């Protein structure tokens, strides 16, 4: 993988030139695209910018995120050749920082369940996860130092775990979803894919200019609370192997780890997530569902069909349960600085299964809005397994700090 | 003005056909558009639907809201001929209810300060208000029964007041802002314009399918709390004359009115509304400001150029203040059912002032998220004056009931 921070430092000390950095990505992409299929379109003419912390940094953009110079096809035939008039605000945050928009990465149709052609860098016979399939795969294949994706259920954490890359889902609404195809406005959150925690940090700093993302340093003796999300069901062995590996490493590094069971209010918030997601999806994809029903990919079309009956009443109750859950989650963070759990059910599913993986271990947090970071831990049978670091809402900076701490911890 | 409720009942019993109703609006638009200029585009071919609670109901759409069959130019030359691919969810809410999208109503450039060419229906020498200029002017001129607009500061209530039409800015996020050109995502709220409060209820019921809007009826002896928003300075005589006339009409109608002070926390919220608004504005229009700076309407260009320096720090600090204002505001409704205040600084300014009017008596409420309803009180010099009925967050139904009550109270 390509480290953004590494590129940054080297370019800063005139050790590496921006044009060089960019030319390397163009090479890295072509070098493996016919094998991974991470890009919907690759702008081979993209060049480094003159100034800015992100000059020489090539970035991939999930194709539900508007670009003014490239089509944004939403992963649907319904939007084939669709060309937005402007760049999404998050794309502008990168461009303003000096970034190079090297292309649009693949995405499941409307960021849902329908698999793309993208394959896992670690194993071409496996899925790279979803819905940010291309962003995760491309960063995992060492094609680009950064990529943007989005999360409604678990389209950022899950695929990063499956592809063995670091990633983060900032606190809800921190990054604007303006010019980002909506699935569910109560959940939709933009995310970043990088090689390491430090890379995500420098990316957020550049995009937002928020001081809390400046000079972040690994956490010292973090207080960690381990939650296995029992309510989500039975986890796969490989996922547990990684969690135990992560726990053991953290303990050796000085962390105090303690198991904990989440409040009943949280179990509930987790159960009604589908309600909020699906009731809104029907409002959000009204035009598509009414005028182009049959053109909506199979899996998404089926879940929308099964849920046309959701009512505003049960939708409102779902949200009350959501709020209850947030208020009680905050209490948990009194005795811990972070929570550590699974990032996915297990290693990435074989492509033959036609599944991008179950978001059951991710969905809850998207609803709570807390910052989440995926920390690569190990690999079983060649397929990556990561753990998920979660902090109090608004403390994205510490989450990355602890994730960083964990990365070093695992490296011993 | 055309009553949505009236047409609904006459169409239901069979007294009026949907085709006739739509042919009615087309003619009404024809008869006045040349002198009011409320539409950016009037679809003369738009036909009625055979079924649905809104069949035979023509609706005007503020031009920052996406439509699939008509351009959405954002009141800006930057978007001349811009054609969205899909209808915005709120537009689909209307279409699914059986309504007819009759045209796009004028909006100031990106819904900010820059005046449109629309004129006040009550006196063409005056402003119809902004930014939802066309939507208010069209309904106020008896052209159409309903119209959608938006409010970041006071774009729904103020223009409604100026044109003497009923209108409601529902509870924040009840109506999705997907497909609605973003100004400030923490503020932007879709709203409706109609003849009377009842037409609003019916409009929301059909769009949302929420039972709270079903069977609404005038309120009885409401507990009204009068707030004059002193923090926003004194209003103009005409505005106070209209407020005093509403209190008197309500009292004489059985209501109990008591003057109230707003918690200091709320005053502070009104103060930092501009920080949240303009800061987010800069992210939401990053493409416009960076790529087409000089093409941005003068006034908005100036306000943006002046807020370039706002920091994430003062922004976070402003939001924090906004949340406190919300909690404590909820306290105020523990002894009162609704708040009664000003809808605008006074009567509509003369076009010669190149001003859509100061939103200072509107902005707070948009930040708090509460449902607000404009109630036409009287007229000074022929120019309409209204008052604003505000209920707790999520009590739109009651805000409409008290508005309906006040309307009857003023009818003596």
CATH homolog superfamily of chain A = Amidase signature (AS) domain
CATH class of chain A: Alpha Beta
- The count of β-strands of chain A is 11
Q: Share of helix among residues of chain A?
A: 25-40%
CATH architecture of chain A: Alpha-Beta Complex
**How many angstroms separate the termini of chain A?**
20 Å
Helical segment tally of chain A?
Answer: 13
Q: How is the biggest beta sheet of chain A arranged?
A: 11 strands, mixed
Strand arrangement, major sheet of chain A: 1-3-2-4-6-5-10-11-9-7-8
Structural class of chain A: alpha/beta
What CATH calls the topology of chain A is Amidase signature (AS) enzymes
Taken as a percent bin, the fraction of beta residues of chain A is 15-25%
Shape of chain A: globular
Q: What is the C-alpha radius of gyration of chain A, as a whole number of Å?
A: 20 Å
Oligomer: homodimer
User: How many domain units of chain A?
Assistant: 1
Q: What is the largest interface, and how many residues per chain?
A: A-B, 32 and 33 residues
Secondary-structure element order of chain A, N to C: HHEEHEHEHEEHEHEHHHHEHEEH
Biased composition (Polar residues) (chains A, B): 115-126
Region (Disordered) (chains A, B): 113-134
InterPro entries (chains A, B): Amidase (IPR000120), Amidase_dom (IPR023631), AS_sf (IPR036928)
Modified residues (Cysteine sulfenic acid (-SOH)) (chains A, B): 155
